[PDB]
Here is the input.
Amino acid sequence: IVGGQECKDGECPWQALLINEENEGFCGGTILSEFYILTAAHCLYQAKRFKVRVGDRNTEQEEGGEAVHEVEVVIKHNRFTKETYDFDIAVLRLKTPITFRMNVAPACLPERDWAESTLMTQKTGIVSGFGRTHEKGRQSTRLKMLEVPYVDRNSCKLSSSFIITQNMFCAGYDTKQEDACQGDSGGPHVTRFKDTYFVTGIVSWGEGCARKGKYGIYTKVTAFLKWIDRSMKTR
Amino acid sequence: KLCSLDNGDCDQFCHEEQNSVVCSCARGYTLADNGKACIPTGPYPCGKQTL
Ligand SMILES: CCOC(=O)[C@H]1CN(S(=O)(=O)c2ccc3cc(Cl)ccc3c2)CC(=O)N1CC1CCN(c2ccncc2)CC1
Ligand SMILES: [Ca+2]
Here is the structure.
């Protein structure tokens, strides 16, 4: 998360973190229910075997509230494809239930038509993670959040170098050195409306990090709602 | 109607019924008795920052 602010205590309670056998946090996620976590599909590649950590706002100091969680079944969105990054979505069901304490709560799922017309038409969104604080710097120690403006469904496509599909959506800046980055993938893109947060998108990809004339490509969450449910029911 | 005036004065999901608004809430809440607001059931509801 190049730039942005530090997720203060109990400010980003849905921030889930995918860790590997090396206890290193490679990708991110979002909590949807005591049992389910929402993550960027490709993410299930930057690892071999992964655990899902929650409650952590610092990768080097016990905050007491964290907790690890093993995955029981992984639901990758079949039609995904690295070659294009389309359908970059997946869903992990935990083996044990998550216990909502502070710094640990689930984010809401909106209703498609509602979301698309009120959530996304909204001025800005919220993106967070432990990822890089610069295209080249090393991963982050603390949990950061960067409020990012919505991007024109068109300017998006133009600035790109690759097709911005149906399941995609831009968010960020055209010149401001702020934007999600490496390791942030899978992260939660949330929209806030009346002091409540909705999962509007997934951290998918971008071309570099916080680059000029380039933006952050997220996964249009509302473009998979009914899938995500079909998933909460497992399938 | 006009679930676009100010979200039909709802707290969350706004819905239209040919002539008027019809509110509802994310799973975890319960619609107030005034058809608009949403109040949680458990102590750690989705969308709310544990403050
Ligand atoms: C030099 C060009 O830079 C790239 O595009 C990089 C970005 N990073 S990353 O870890 O800092 C990275 C990962 C996810 C992000 C998500 C948001 Cl919203 C914002 C910034 C991000 C930065 C990882 C990576 O694998 N690449 C190379 C890739 C990623 C995008 N590509 C596509 C090709 C065809 N279709 C879609 C996408 C080309 C190669
Ligand atoms: Ca810790």
